[PDB]
Amino acid sequence: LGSPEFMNKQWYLLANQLILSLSKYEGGHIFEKLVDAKKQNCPDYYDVIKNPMSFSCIKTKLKKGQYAYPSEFVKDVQLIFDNCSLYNTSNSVVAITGKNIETYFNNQLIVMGYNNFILKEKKINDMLKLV
Numbered sequence: 001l002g003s004p005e006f007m008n009k010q011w012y013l014l015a016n017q018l019i020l021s022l023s024k025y026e027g028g029h030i031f032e033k034l035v036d037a038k039k040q041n042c043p044d045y046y047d048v049i050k051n052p053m054s055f056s057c058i059k060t061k062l063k064k065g066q067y068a069y070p071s072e073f074v075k076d077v078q079l080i081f082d083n084c085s086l087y088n089t090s091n092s093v094v095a096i097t098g099k100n101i102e103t104y105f106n107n108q109l110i111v112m113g114y115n116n117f118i119l120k121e122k123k124i125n126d127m128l129k130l131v
């Protein structure tokens with residue numbers, strides 16, 4: 001019940017619930033799929049954003065088991081909000097929406113206790129490099 005596999009199954013379920021609540025939050029539809037430069041009238045998006053990321057890209061990596069640490073899931077989610085704060089002007093609707101979901105995501109990490117999984121990840125790496 002306390003095995004490393006039980007914890008690894010836990011934060012995979014917490015991340016899967018997190019990426020669902022982000023997809024359902026207000027304005028979350030603008031981060032679900034990757035930006036189609038032609039349909040959204042942004043021909044220079046991938047000339048500025050070189051590491052694109054969307055909710056669908058994170059759901060796929062969760063389904064294929066491509067996250068080794070719980071901190072890697074947060075980095076992909078934060079990358080979405082970082083690409084949003086970069087390409088979009090600070091007073092644009094998208095940038096405001098991105099900041100609102102960013103706060104929601106960070107507060108959901110507190111409520112769900114996901115951060116405690118990242119801390120134990122760091123301690124385990126310490127108690128492993130010491131041997």
Ligand SMILES: Cc1cc(C(N)=O)ccc1-c1[nH]c(C)c2c1CCCCC2=O
Binds near residue numbers: 029036045084
């Ligand atoms: C993909 C997308 C879809 C819709 C939709 N179909 O409702 C609305 C907005 C956006 C969107 N998402 C991001 C992440 C952005 C944009 C708009 C373009 C500027 C780049 C940017 O930050």
